[PDB]
Structure formats: C-alpha cells, structure tokens
Swiss-Prot record:
The active site is at Y146, H284 (proton acceptor). It is found in: Plastid, Chloroplast stroma, Chloroplast nucleoid. Residues 39-293 are annotated as: AP endonuclease. One of its GO terms (molecular function) is phosphatase activity. The keyword Ion transport does not apply. Keywords: Chloroplast, DNA damage, DNA repair, Hydrolase, Magnesium, Metal-binding, Plastid. The chain holds residues 241 to 536 of 536 of the full protein. The record marks D258 as: Important for catalytic activity. Its cofactor is Mg(2+); Mn(2+). Disruption phenotype: No visible phenotype. Loss of chloroplastic glycosylase-lyase/endonuclease activity. Hypersensitivity to 5-fluorouracil. Ape1l arp double mutants have no visible phenotype. Ape2 arp double mutants have no visible phenotype. It catalyses: Exonucleolytic cleavage in the 3'- to 5'-direction to yield nucleoside 5'-phosphates. GO terms for biological process: DNA repair; positive regulation of DNA-templated transcription. This is DNA-(apurinic or apyrimidinic site) endonuclease, chloroplastic. Changing R114W: In arp-1; loss of activity.
Length: 293
C-alpha cells in the first residue's frame, strides 16, 4: 500500500498527478560525479523517534547514504546533547545542536554530518528556541531551520510575519554574499494550493494563511531562492506532513511544509529534490536533496 501515490486533493487542476518516488525520481548520477546528499526531517521529538520500534539509524544511513542529516523539533535540552551525541552511529562525527532554552523540551534543530564544516553558528550566538543552525561548507552554506508555527487561532502570526520571517530572510541574504545558500527544514508554510490537500478548508489555519504564503513568496522566493522540489516537479502533488489527529496519512490528506530552498546560483546543480513518504516515526516524513558540486 502506497497511499502517497494516490492523488488526494479537494480542488486539483486537470493535469495534476500524485508524487511517486519510484517512477518520478531522476536516474542516479554518473559515477564519480562529485555531489553532496542532504536529508531533512522533522522528527517530532527525537527521543520518541528513537523509541519507535521500526526505526534504526543504521538502516536509514545504509538506505540513503546521505552526507548530512538536518533535524527539526529534536525537543532536546542543552544538557541532553552530550549523551545524544554518543548514540550517533559510526561515520557521522560532526554534529551540531541548537536547543530551546526558554521553553524546555520544545523546538530544537541539529545538523549531523560526515563532512566537517568550516564553521557553524547558532542563530542570526542567540537562538532562544533553537530554531537555526548554519554550517559552512566549501562551496555553499547549509541553513537548517524550524520556522515558528503561527499556532491555534493564529496567536503567533504577528511574530511570524512581522519579526521571524524578515529575520530569516536577512540572515540568508547576508550569508549569500559569501557563498550560495541551501535553506532547508520545516518552513511551516504550504506555499500554493498544490501544497495542501484542502486549501479551501484551511484559509485561516496556521501554515496556509494569505499572510504566511505571501511572505514566503516575497521574503524567500522573490529574493533569489528556488523551491527545488516544485521546480523539479511542476504539477505534482507531494506532501511531507500529515496531521495525526484526523488520521490523514492513510489517505494522503497532507501538506508540504518541508523544503529545500537554494540560491539561484546553484539551482542548476540540483540533480534530485525528493520526498520519502514511506518512512514513519513522525507526522513528517523526510525529504532529500542531491546537489552537484
């Protein structure tokens, strides 16, 4: 059963198809093509995921052979990182964790890499909610972020639009002045109607407000960044999130909230921006990016 291959959408256009990674991913790169492979995942609580019976860090690494793993919502405290680092599997020696210090057991990001970065900074070193990690590599910057959820009743929409969204934009544009940027993580916005199963029923839901979508366009895309999955798959409905409560994953009633956004300068180097909807353990599934260097 592969429910993500069934086109679930309340108001689809005529020529839209459901994303099937078995038939729609490009063929592998010619061998020796120097590239970097990144996987990104909102794990909805790292400790809980590690207690998930069907989850193994070793199998995931063996299956995808990523160089870098970007996590959101680790929910770790600072005091937890030393021990969590010890459970990292062999081969991924450089790990960097930004944990929430005001609200405990909340938010949290991490970058796990078998490539040693030139530099790593946390925040835009103030990161009170552990929402941003920036790792410098030789030809690009990798920014892993967990964007603030606007919340029930849009209670946080003002901070999201007026403060957060602009600060993230300024941070990536500043770094772009030295190297192109790979922005990834849970951006907490379904950009267009194709990115959400029920657009009409969610006009005032966090993540699909007119305010959030317009900011996404104006503060991210229109400042020279490319939605790699959307560019690679025009007219393809593919989700990365399914709400637990209404059991929408079994019928693919989901949203695309997780992205790979890249500087215009390296948009042509993206070989594959993909989704892994079969991996369970969170209400998000992982996404991956294969970038030619």
């Amino acid at each position: 059963s592969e429910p993500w291959t069934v086109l679930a959408h309340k108001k689809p256009q005529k020529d839209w198809k459901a994303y099937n990674p078995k038939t729609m991913r490009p063929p592998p790169l010619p061998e020796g093509t120097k590239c970097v492979k990144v996987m990104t995942w909102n794990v909805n609580g790292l400790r809980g995921l590690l207690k998930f019976e069907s989850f193994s860090a070793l199998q995931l690494a063996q299956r995808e052979n990523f160089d870098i793993l970007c996590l959101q919502e680790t929910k770790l405290q600072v005091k937890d990182v030393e021990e969590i680092k010890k459970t990292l599997i062999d081969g991924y020696d450089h790990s960097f964790w930004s944990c929430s210090v005001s609200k405990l057991g909340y938010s949290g990001t991490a970058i796990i890499s078998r490539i040693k970065p030139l530099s790593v900074r946390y925040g835009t070193g103030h990161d009170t909610e552990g929402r941003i990690v920036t790792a410098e590599f030789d030809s690009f910057y990798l920014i892993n972020t967990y964007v603030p959820n606007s919340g029930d009743g849009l209670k946080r929409l003002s901070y999201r639009i007026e403060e957060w969204d602009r600060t993230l934009s300024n941070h990536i544009k500043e770094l772009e002045k030295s190297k192109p940027v790979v922005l990834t993580g849970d951006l907490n916005c379904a950009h267009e109607e194709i990115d959400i199963f029920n657009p009409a029923g969610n006009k005032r839901s966090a993540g699909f407000t007119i305010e959030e979508r317009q900011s996404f366009g104006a503060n991210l895309l229109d400042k020279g960044f490319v939605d790699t999955f959307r560019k690679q798959h025009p007219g393809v409905v593919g989700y990365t999130y399914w709400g637990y409560r209404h059991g929408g994953r079994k019928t693919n009633k989901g949203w695309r909230l997780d992205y790979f956004l890249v500087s215009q300068s390296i948009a042509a180097n993206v070989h594959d921006s993909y989704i892994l909807p079969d991996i369970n353990g969170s209400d998000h599934c992982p996404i991956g990016l294969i970038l030619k260097l």
